[model samples]
Target: IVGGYTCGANTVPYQVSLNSGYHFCGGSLINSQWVVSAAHCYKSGIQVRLGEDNINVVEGNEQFISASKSIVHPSYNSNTLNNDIMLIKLKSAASLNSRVASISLPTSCASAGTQCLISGWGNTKSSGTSYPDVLKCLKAPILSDSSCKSAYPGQITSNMFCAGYLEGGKDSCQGDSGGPVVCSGKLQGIVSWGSGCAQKNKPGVYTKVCNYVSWIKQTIASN
Candidate 1:
């Protein structure tokens, strides 16, 4: 989170860390066996860690698991960042507990101006190299599609959305990719990308989860 603070322990039970070799990214558990994340975060040797707050050491409640399979949207375009979402299937079902749970997916579209929550173990500033040891959280306001489009112009797509402050100083940064954007207690988006961390008028972009509900369901079932 670019402008956020350490989140309370176990405050976000569905939050997970995606370790790709040495790098870190955030993700959300949609179910006991499935994680929703940004497609761009996908890489070889990806692993999932749940029920964790600190990333430097293993916690008693943490559960580490390998990805059995992954499904990146077929139409995902890295250059344009269109349809930038993916699903990871866990090797086995996770044991749900107080510190580990799945978040509910949205049944319908999220309206603009809706308040949302974002959490991750990402850098606190745009140029910072060090990431937070504990999970950090921030609140953001969803930008209307048209407003979002005006900011990005031809780059904004229907499958993508934006959230953050136009004045800057509050947004997601590096290592925050693939994290959740929960609105009204439902999974609404996944952290994708941005021009720079907390840049003025450059709100963070996210993969609109509602736009890919069908794809997510089909992928989960097939896997």
Candidate 2:
């Protein structure tokens, strides 16, 4: 979602789309079986597509879940990715409606100017492989964290937190890793890591997600 627009069908409907067979990463449906993502997009036969905005269609408000568990947060730090976060746990629970649901966590922890929203199918160009058959957003705002830890100082940590636009175009790219960054509507941040895809003073870095809300309900109430 670099400089974006184009979401609408199910306007975000909790949004998910990891899919091992392609699509890459993006998730955050937090209930009816949990989800939330990023631990560097842990992979391996994954497949979770919820409502979805044209992940290249068949859009009958899709569902395709799976992943009995993919916890990944044992202090996850693929060399400074820090506790990048991840949860999953769905082997079949999403049965909501209208398009799907759930997306609330984050009782407030995003700072700076606020603004938010950053959905994705990623790459609307920042020198890309051109992803995006739908789902693309990008409203950008939240900025300070001492100017994002001085534009990537110790590689920004505190479980991460950066948001976009420091004279850049817009941000979040590369299949929008673990997407979602919203605001008042919560789910605060997710799209972890960035230094290029829409740069100026760099700006994407997310996953602060209200400091993990008790590690996402104590890791979904103890597995």
Candidate 3:
């Protein structure tokens, strides 16, 4: 089932280990055929776990899958977090089991100013580190287009979306980047970047999933 609602976490469950000596955030599943994640998590030799809540448990529905083909958006600009999203085509389809499952994509975007749910293994407090557990999630409300655009100035491109606590004390943290910002049964955005993890005036920026649908469909069709 879908995991957490991220203020700094998510419902997507995966076995994330720093096998490559560096840490990055990622999503667990999209359709059964693919896993949506971040390009930053693409470091060679990283380990990804699916179907288990506990990192230590390998039994039950937990299965290990190697990322065979990784597709990072061609225009991904690390300096600005542009096109920072990526997809991991598993070597093979994941074995369907009780613990492991897939997430649904948004057929359309939520109307502006709606609440969306997010989850990841990201930090809980504003400047905390990644969680040692599997996942964490929280509820968030979607900001108005004008508000989002005004919040980030010119950086809030149409390609991106925004969400966060309007007051304070909650948001996606470090390893939370690249997870989904889902609302009303649709995936409206992908966790992109946030300044200082939850500081006032610095809301979480997300890659507009609905805006990228055409590109995603093209990529999937060609593969």
Candidate 4:
């Protein structure tokens, strides 16, 4: 994540690396075998790596698993970025321990002014070409839906929400798509898109997790 610091290993145990020869996106382990990420982050040959912080190194606590199925939300709109979420079913279930676990899903929508934490291996700088090997994290406050609506004008939708700094200092950037946006210790949003990394009046847009809770469960069960 841009404008963030290197995070301690296993500090956010549910954090995952969506890798295809390299780290492409971030994901959250919602259960032993299910991973949730952004639908637009979908790519062929993606694998899920769990229980690790450093992306470039293999650790004893790591579990590398192939995806058995990758399902994007049927209503996902690439242009509008609506319902931009995905569920990945791993071929094998992860082994839960201190270093590996799942995050709790939100029971309701996150309120405005709620501070949340975002983690990823995205570029540290907006103009950087390379991503970090270690996980990075930053804190951002949820903006009022109306405030976000004002920022993006016609872009914001009911299925989406916004977060970041109006001062243009901190945010999730490129390569950080599909990352977890946790608020109050629960999975609240998924990093979907943005205008630019930490730009003034341009907050990061996220897939509102609460809006798709039933869809997520239905997808998992039918799959």
Q: Give the 10-residue window scoring lowest on summed lDDT in candidate 1.
A: 18-27
TM-score of each: 0.97, 0.36, 0.84, 0.97
Instruction: List the RMSD of every prediction in angstroms.
Output: 1.1, 13.6, 3.8, 1.0
Pairs in steric clash, model 1 = none
Model 4: per-residue Cα lDDT over 1-223, one tens digit each: 7788877888989999998998889999999999999999988898899987888887667899999989999998898989999999999989998789999988899998999999998877766566788889998899999989998999999998899877787889898899999999999999999887888888899989998889888888888
Top model number, lDDT: 4
Stretches of candidate 2 off by over 4 Å are: 5-25, 28-36, 39-51, 54-61, 64-70, 76-81, 92-134, 137-150, 157-166, 173-177, 180-190, 193-202, 206-223
Off by over 4 Å in 4: none
Stretches off by above 4 angstroms in model 1 are: none
Per-residue lDDT for 1-223 in model 1, tens only? Answer: 9888788878999999998664478899999999998888878778899998888877688898999888888999999989888889999999998799999999997988999999999888877576778899999999888878888888998888899987899998888999999999899999998898998989999989998888888777877
Over 173-203, each residue of candidate 2 has an lDDT whose tens digit, in order, gives: 8878987888888888899888778878887
Number of backbone collisions per candidate: 0, 0, 17, 0
How well does candidate 2 match the true structure in TM-score terms? 0.36
List runs of model 3 lying over 4 Å from the truth.
Answer: 1-23, 56-59, 128-132
For lDDT, candidate 2 versus 4, the one ahead is 4
Candidate 3 global CA lDDT score: 0.65
Per-residue lDDT for 1-223 in model 3, tens only? 0123422221344323222333366574766557777666566655455664544444455556666777888878887777767877777777654345665666877766788777666676665454646566667887777877777788877677778754556777777676767777666777788767777777787887876677777897888
